[PDB]
Structure formats: structure tokens, C-alpha cells
């Protein structure tokens, strides 16, 4: 006898009137629903049933749990059958109608959840330091009480629940820690990801290679150093999920490598709200960033890898910024607060950057950590034209259909050059002309262009791009002593 | 008793995701709601209710007590339907948060489910607490309209005893003509004035003038571009042929006042762009049709923000919205020069208004910035 959840059907609809398929106190009228073996097909009813508030679609991260001296899991049997179905909505379930939440119905998981929350509320009020986590049919109960007092408390919970018809496994039949939940291995004082066995094969198909890479990633969450690049060349051009791909010489290397890394076990400690949160970020190769979050030096709560080209043209500062933004977003979810950052960029580099970037950009409280490689700015465009430096008036243009173009320049000093391009685009020819001025000029240049497009890319100080051409332009720019780019209207 | 309110025909309630909130804000909301429930303002809801609205906490102008803020933007776009041209001329307008009044009035019982909102829990450790208003909620467009006949009926004596002062109501606020709108000025385009001019100088000038001619076609750069004929050193000084001096003069004159034929049409969306200049400076333009600016402005950061671009932006955005309401009686749609996630993460930290304007994120062109400062 737990309060009943009222339920209607989507406006302008009526209960399922689906004929019965010919075949061979929880249930007691123009409707009917298919039933056989006892599995009911409520697909039609569900398509008639109103919408309910989402079920727990976001699960907790171990990194954000607090240490408990003892933990227990209680699986609730006959969960759904233990809760009453809206008296009025009962008719629409005829098949003999239900009096309880039906297995396989739309609002069952939700109403059950809502019910459990209301049943737990009392017991919770009385037990403020006993933490209960509801996850489908399971009840995870942790506390800081010693082994015996804890057992006594679980027994209270079991009885409270029993008052409501909810039965649970006694101490003898309960499952004991650690808990294997959603790819994790939970201990009352430490966590980790469940066992990772890299198959030792001599015949790998596409399905094996993909699953492997699949397992590898999920581990990187705690095992920094793993690599998947030399395996992720094994999929290129694969004809089918059963095509057996021979592990290249380098493919057995990376694997053997990871295989070894995975041999040494690493455990994530839990969260202590009395201490500060701290995240440190390293630049692990161009475009790849790593990070670890902790409260005590080396006792990581969570660690991670980022590799996201936010577009096509960026730099380490912008990349550093985004990494910080993602870590911040995770942090708010998991712990409810932003960690203090330890970043590999000097205050003055960051200052120079955000102060003159056209986009509002910000980084929460952080401090420089001197760990090479440091993120810096590879070149700074001159704020005013350079005296004594040659001036290149560049120009590019390509017919958008023949993809035929020309790019070149003319300097104040009489220097001129015109190159013909093929299979090019206007933009590419505009970039090309700038490229040329840079190539053929000294350590100091004044470059005039009519390309807003090129002007924009370059002014943003990119240092990494997908465009080979933009990358050549960066290389040149890094070499120059002074470069002043200036725009002028075209035509 | 309650007045029947409804969603626009055929439409349904809002199911907008709740953004993650910090521990501080969650505790804050939890304390605020627990009492609101005690006063019957809000009441817990079951799973039978599929709707939702985002909520967060803010801290009003120089106040230390938390203010629950519900982003009813979605519910407002779906709520069925139901300006003092002198206000902008007033010497001093004051903003009075008269949002609490709404609580005294009950909300149609049939409409309440659409006001559903959720208070999240850190790390999803719990299912979150769900409520729905039983009274006119703060920040909903229905509330000010419903509490209208009543709001006037109480401001009947003051505007008859003082029919001089203007009273304007926009959502949860009251504007009595602390703003000083008689000092609001539109940033006019401005060409450089210099002793000497280098090739570079004239180029930039010709550039700005080219752009400016999109708004003022009378502008001519013919004479100036001749002084550019040839391929000379950027740093090479160029004396102005007199034909140019005059060409530069007319342009100046043309840019001494806003362009003609620029009226405000209340049947069109009001748009606002913002550019980050630097040195904590921010330009903006309000228009409805490209190049036909209803207003152009400038914003200087306030203290305690020198190190924070996002605060500046949000402060600027609120500054600009206030001007919109104080002038047209509407909030514009913002084109925010900032990465969506950066913004969506901290805006709620520097926000103090009770309304939330609409926004989108852009990639400001280099040129346009050189043209607005
Ligand atoms: C998200 C989740 C899943 C399973 C168990 C828990 C659980 S059981 C009760 C809540 N949790 C804790 O505080 C905790 C700490 C260490 C181990 C287990 C737990 C939490």
C-alpha cells in the first residue's frame, strides 16, 4: 500500500484493442493486449501512454563518491509487481488486467523509482549519515558505521522496506564488495575499472580490432599511456567485420606495450570535501592533452585524455582553454565545484593572449606549472607597419569552376612573381599569395592583402591546422623576425 | 481564484534539460524551495509530469541573499498571448524588483504542470527534487499580464497624484522615470585626424570608409585611392592632394549624424551584436535590418572584472538588455562573441537580472572591430 501514481494516455487516444495471437494478487472493457509464454507486448499501450519524467540517465562517477567504512548492495525482488498501478488506468492493461506495475510497460521504471524515493525518504531522514544510491532494482547502501553496527542498520533498512512489501536478500545471500558497476570495481575505500584482458591471438578480425580499441579507451580513464593509434591503421579500408587483419610489425608492439602497462594495477582514491580539488594538464603531443585530478599529490581521483580539433585552425592556447573548459564541466557535475588548475602556460603568455583575442575567453583560478612542453605563442603579428621592411602587395584568384588560379605579388622594391595554380580554390589562392610573400622575403615583412578570409585565419595566430598550406604559412611566420599583415578592400 | 491560461494551440509544455549547478547553488536552491513549499508557493511532483525548466541561483544588485532564477524562455515561447516613448527621455529611471507580488496570486491549476522544474544533485547520486508552481511564477510572461489589472489598480493613485513620473513594467521589474537614459549616446563612426599620413594610414582609412559606405553610400574614396596608386612602402608618408582633403571632409560631415530612414518596427526581432575591443572595452549595435542601426553603443568594464572576460560580457549583455527595455520595451537577441560552452558554464555566475534574453554564438570578423572603435 504505497500511494498510486495517476496516469492518462496521450490526448485523443484510447487503450490498445489489439486482437489476441492464437496460442496453445497482482491482477484481477473494450481493450486487450498480447500475452504469451508470461511476457506481455505493451508496445501499443506504451505508444498510448503519456510521457513521464526521465529515469536516472546520468550515473555517478566513483571519483565523486566519499569513502565509506562499509558498503552493501540490496537487490529488490519483484520490484515492479510490488507497486500498485493507477486504479483508473488499470483497464487499459487488460489481456484479466493488472493491479501492479507491469514488467515491460512504459511508466513502470519511472513510477517504481518515484515510489522507492518516497519509501526511502523516512528512513533517510532518520539516518542522515547512511547513504543510499538507487539504481534500477539495486540499492547501494554505504555507511561509516563499523562492521556490526552497519549490518544492524542494513537489517533496519530491510525491515523498513519490508513494511512496504519490498523484499530483499538477507546478509547470507547479498553480494559482497567490491562492486562491479558500469565498468568499475568499487571498494569502500578505493575504486577502479574491472579487469582488462587483452586477447593473446594470432588471427585478428575487424570485430576483434574494434572491440580491443574499445576496451583500450575505457581504460585510459585511469591508465595513462595506452596507445591505440597503431591499431586504429589496422581498420583502414576494411572490407568486412570478419576480414582477418594481420597485426603489422608495429601493431604487435603497441599491443605488447599496453599489455604490459595493464599488468600494473592502479586504483582511484575517493573524494574528501575537506580538501581542495586540483587538476593538472599536460600537452601530450600536438592536439592531445592529458590531465589528472586529485586532492593529494599523486593520489588521483580521476584522470583523462582529450583530443578534439575544435575546428580546423587552432593553437595550444585555445586548445589549453578548451581542455580547461571540459575539465571544469566534468568537475561541476562530479564534485559540484571547479578545481584549482595547475597549467603549463605562463601568466604573461595567457595575458597576452586573452587580452587581444576577439573572443571572450577565461580560465578559472590556476597557476603555472613548469613542466615541459610549455604552451606558448609561436609568433606575434606586428601591431604597426615595419619601417625598412619590404612591402608585398599580394593577390590570388581562382575561377570557382575550372578551379584554375594564379597567385603572386609585387613589392615596393620591384620584386614580382606570378604562379599558376590548378585544382585550387579562391581561398587557397589567397593563402598561397601570402605564402609566397613570406617565402621570398627577409626576416621582416609588410604584407598587404585583400583577403578577409586569409587575414582572419592568420590573425588568430594558429600553430596547427588541417590545411597543409596554412601549416606552411605558420612555419614561415615562426621564422620571421617581424610580420605585419594589413588588409585593403578588393577591386 | 485563478484565470485560465493556455499554451498556444496544439503546442505542449517545455522539456528543457537542467544544466549542472555547483554545490553552493544546489544547497541555496534546496533551502529556498523547502520554504517555498512550506508557504504553498511550490509543491512536489511525481513522474506523471514529463515537463521541465532550467533553474539556477543568482545574487541581486549588491545583495547577499540568494535569488532563485527560472529560465522560462521555453515556456514563454509557448505561452498563449494576451510602450512609454517618454521613458527613454527621462533624466533618471529606477528599477524596482516587484517580482514577489506574483506569489500572492494563484496560477490556473491546469497550467501548473508546465511550470515544472528540477533541483539537481551533485554527481547524480540522487534523482533530484521535482516541483511545480501553484502560484504565478517569477519570470514567466503570464505573471505580469495576469497580475496586470491588479498592478495598475494599485498604481492608480500614484500616477494620478504624480501623473508626471512615468511607470513602466517589464516582467518582474518596475521602471520609474538607477538608470540615466538622457545620457545614452550612439557611437558615431569616426575617421582619424592626423598631421602626417603614411600609405598604411590611408589604406586603413579607405578600408573603414569602404565599410562605412555600406551605411552611407554618399561616401567617396576615389581621391584617397589615387594617393594609393603605385606600390609603395607602407611607412611612406603621403601628403594629401587637396582633392583628397575635400574628399575626406565630405565624408566626415556625412558621418556626423545617424543615417536617415531608420525607424523601429515592433513586428520585427530586435538584434544586438557585441565586439570585444580590448582594454576591457566592448562595442555593440542594436538593429533589426543590417546596417540600419537603431543604436550603437560602447561598454567599459566595471571594477572587479579586469581579469575576467566572461563577467565583462555578461555584465555588458545585461547593460545592453536594460537599454533595450528602457527604449523599445523588448529584449534583443544577442550574437555573443564567445564559445557556447565557455558561456553556458559561467554566465549564471555574474547574472543579476530576472529576465534572460535570447542569444547565439558568433565568430567576429577581424575587420569589423577596426571599424567600430
Ligand atoms: C554510484 C555508486 C554505485 C555503487 C555503489 C555506490 C556506493 S553504495 C552507497 C552510495 N555509494 C557510496 O558512497 C560508495 C562508496 C564506495 C563504494 C560504493 C559506494 C555508489
Short mmCIF file of N, CA, C and O and ligand atoms in Angstrom, two decimals, chain A residues 59-62 64-68 70-73 130-133 135 139-143 177 179 181 186-191 270, chain B residues 123-125, ligand 1:
data_model
loop_
_atom_site.label_atom_id
_atom_site.label_comp_id
_atom_site.label_asym_id
_atom_site.label_seq_id
_atom_site.Cartn_x
_atom_site.Cartn_y
_atom_site.Cartn_z
N UNK A 59 24.60 8.63 -14.49
CA UNK A 59 25.08 7.87 -13.35
C UNK A 59 26.25 8.60 -12.68
O UNK A 59 26.91 9.44 -13.30
N UNK A 60 26.52 8.28 -11.40
CA UNK A 60 27.61 8.90 -10.63
C UNK A 60 28.99 8.43 -10.97
O UNK A 60 29.19 7.29 -11.36
N UNK A 61 29.97 9.31 -10.82
CA UNK A 61 31.34 8.89 -11.08
C UNK A 61 31.98 8.51 -9.74
O UNK A 61 31.83 9.20 -8.73
N UNK A 62 32.66 7.37 -9.72
CA UNK A 62 33.30 6.93 -8.48
C UNK A 62 34.17 8.04 -7.92
O UNK A 62 34.21 8.27 -6.71
N UNK A 64 33.71 10.94 -7.63
CA UNK A 64 32.97 11.85 -6.77
C UNK A 64 32.26 11.27 -5.55
O UNK A 64 31.45 11.97 -4.93
N UNK A 65 32.54 10.03 -5.18
CA UNK A 65 31.89 9.42 -4.01
C UNK A 65 32.81 9.63 -2.81
O UNK A 65 34.00 9.88 -2.97
N UNK A 66 32.26 9.54 -1.60
CA UNK A 66 33.07 9.71 -0.38
C UNK A 66 33.35 8.32 0.17
O UNK A 66 32.55 7.40 -0.03
N UNK A 67 34.47 8.15 0.86
CA UNK A 67 34.81 6.86 1.43
C UNK A 67 33.81 6.47 2.49
O UNK A 67 33.35 7.30 3.27
N UNK A 68 33.48 5.18 2.50
CA UNK A 68 32.56 4.63 3.47
C UNK A 68 33.33 3.49 4.10
O UNK A 68 34.15 2.85 3.42
N UNK A 70 31.92 0.82 5.36
CA UNK A 70 31.24 -0.39 4.91
C UNK A 70 30.19 -0.10 3.84
O UNK A 70 29.54 0.94 3.87
N UNK A 71 30.05 -1.01 2.88
CA UNK A 71 29.07 -0.82 1.82
C UNK A 71 28.35 -2.13 1.54
O UNK A 71 28.90 -3.20 1.72
N UNK A 72 27.10 -2.03 1.09
CA UNK A 72 26.25 -3.19 0.86
C UNK A 72 25.33 -2.94 -0.33
O UNK A 72 24.93 -1.80 -0.56
N UNK A 73 25.01 -3.97 -1.10
CA UNK A 73 24.05 -3.78 -2.18
C UNK A 73 22.84 -4.70 -1.90
O UNK A 73 23.00 -5.85 -1.51
N UNK A 130 23.75 7.66 6.53
CA UNK A 130 23.63 6.40 5.79
C UNK A 130 23.27 6.82 4.37
O UNK A 130 22.18 7.33 4.14
N UNK A 131 24.17 6.62 3.43
CA UNK A 131 23.91 7.00 2.05
C UNK A 131 23.36 5.85 1.21
O UNK A 131 23.97 4.78 1.13
N UNK A 132 22.22 6.10 0.57
CA UNK A 132 21.56 5.11 -0.27
C UNK A 132 21.51 5.59 -1.72
O UNK A 132 21.03 6.68 -2.00
N UNK A 133 21.99 4.75 -2.62
CA UNK A 133 22.00 5.05 -4.05
C UNK A 133 21.08 4.08 -4.80
O UNK A 133 21.30 2.86 -4.80
N UNK A 135 19.61 2.49 -8.12
CA UNK A 135 19.99 2.23 -9.49
C UNK A 135 19.19 1.04 -10.00
O UNK A 135 19.60 -0.11 -9.86
N UNK A 139 19.91 -1.34 -4.64
CA UNK A 139 20.01 -0.30 -3.61
C UNK A 139 21.41 -0.39 -3.05
O UNK A 139 21.75 -1.37 -2.41
N UNK A 140 22.25 0.60 -3.32
CA UNK A 140 23.59 0.57 -2.76
C UNK A 140 23.57 1.38 -1.47
O UNK A 140 23.20 2.55 -1.46
N UNK A 141 23.94 0.73 -0.37
CA UNK A 141 23.90 1.37 0.94
C UNK A 141 25.25 1.38 1.60
O UNK A 141 25.76 0.34 1.95
N UNK A 142 25.82 2.56 1.78
CA UNK A 142 27.12 2.65 2.42
C UNK A 142 27.03 3.47 3.69
O UNK A 142 26.17 4.34 3.81
N UNK A 143 27.89 3.19 4.66
CA UNK A 143 27.86 3.95 5.91
C UNK A 143 29.23 3.99 6.55
O UNK A 143 30.14 3.27 6.14
N UNK A 177 31.16 -6.65 -1.63
CA UNK A 177 32.10 -5.82 -2.37
C UNK A 177 33.31 -6.64 -2.77
O UNK A 177 33.55 -7.69 -2.21
N UNK A 179 32.12 -3.88 -5.79
CA UNK A 179 31.01 -3.86 -6.72
C UNK A 179 31.41 -3.59 -8.16
O UNK A 179 32.05 -2.58 -8.45
N UNK A 181 30.22 -2.32 -11.18
CA UNK A 181 29.13 -1.49 -11.68
C UNK A 181 29.61 -0.60 -12.83
O UNK A 181 30.61 0.12 -12.71
N UNK A 186 34.16 -1.09 -7.43
CA UNK A 186 34.03 -0.30 -6.21
C UNK A 186 34.36 -0.97 -4.88
O UNK A 186 33.78 -2.00 -4.52
N UNK A 187 35.26 -0.34 -4.15
CA UNK A 187 35.66 -0.81 -2.82
C UNK A 187 35.23 0.30 -1.90
O UNK A 187 35.11 1.45 -2.32
N UNK A 188 35.01 0.00 -0.63
CA UNK A 188 34.60 1.08 0.27
C UNK A 188 35.67 2.15 0.50
O UNK A 188 35.38 3.20 1.06
N UNK A 189 36.90 1.88 0.06
CA UNK A 189 38.00 2.82 0.26
C UNK A 189 38.82 3.10 -1.00
O UNK A 189 39.86 3.75 -0.90
N UNK A 190 38.38 2.61 -2.15
CA UNK A 190 39.11 2.84 -3.40
C UNK A 190 38.32 2.29 -4.57
O UNK A 190 37.46 1.43 -4.37
N UNK A 191 38.59 2.77 -5.77
CA UNK A 191 37.87 2.28 -6.93
C UNK A 191 38.83 1.90 -8.04
O UNK A 191 40.03 1.84 -7.83
N UNK A 270 39.07 7.98 -3.23
CA UNK A 270 37.79 8.69 -3.22
C UNK A 270 37.90 10.16 -2.85
O UNK A 270 38.97 10.65 -2.51
N UNK B 123 26.83 14.85 -8.73
CA UNK B 123 27.15 13.50 -9.20
C UNK B 123 25.98 12.55 -9.41
O UNK B 123 26.14 11.33 -9.37
N UNK B 124 24.79 13.09 -9.66
CA UNK B 124 23.62 12.26 -9.91
C UNK B 124 23.37 11.20 -8.84
O UNK B 124 22.68 10.21 -9.09
N UNK B 125 23.93 11.41 -7.65
CA UNK B 125 23.76 10.46 -6.57
C UNK B 125 22.30 10.25 -6.15
O UNK B 125 21.97 9.24 -5.52
C1 LIG C 1 27.40 5.34 -7.71
C2 LIG C 1 27.53 4.16 -6.81
C3 LIG C 1 27.46 2.85 -7.32
C4 LIG C 1 27.58 1.75 -6.46
C5 LIG C 1 27.77 1.95 -5.09
C6 LIG C 1 27.85 3.25 -4.57
C7 LIG C 1 28.11 3.49 -3.06
S1 LIG C 1 26.98 2.49 -2.01
C8 LIG C 1 26.17 3.92 -1.34
C9 LIG C 1 26.49 5.04 -2.10
N1 LIG C 1 27.87 4.84 -2.57
C10 LIG C 1 28.97 5.34 -1.86
O1 LIG C 1 29.00 6.36 -1.20
C11 LIG C 1 30.06 4.40 -2.10
C12 LIG C 1 31.41 4.50 -1.79
C13 LIG C 1 32.27 3.44 -2.11
C14 LIG C 1 31.77 2.29 -2.75
C15 LIG C 1 30.41 2.20 -3.05
C16 LIG C 1 29.55 3.27 -2.73
C17 LIG C 1 27.73 4.34 -5.44
#
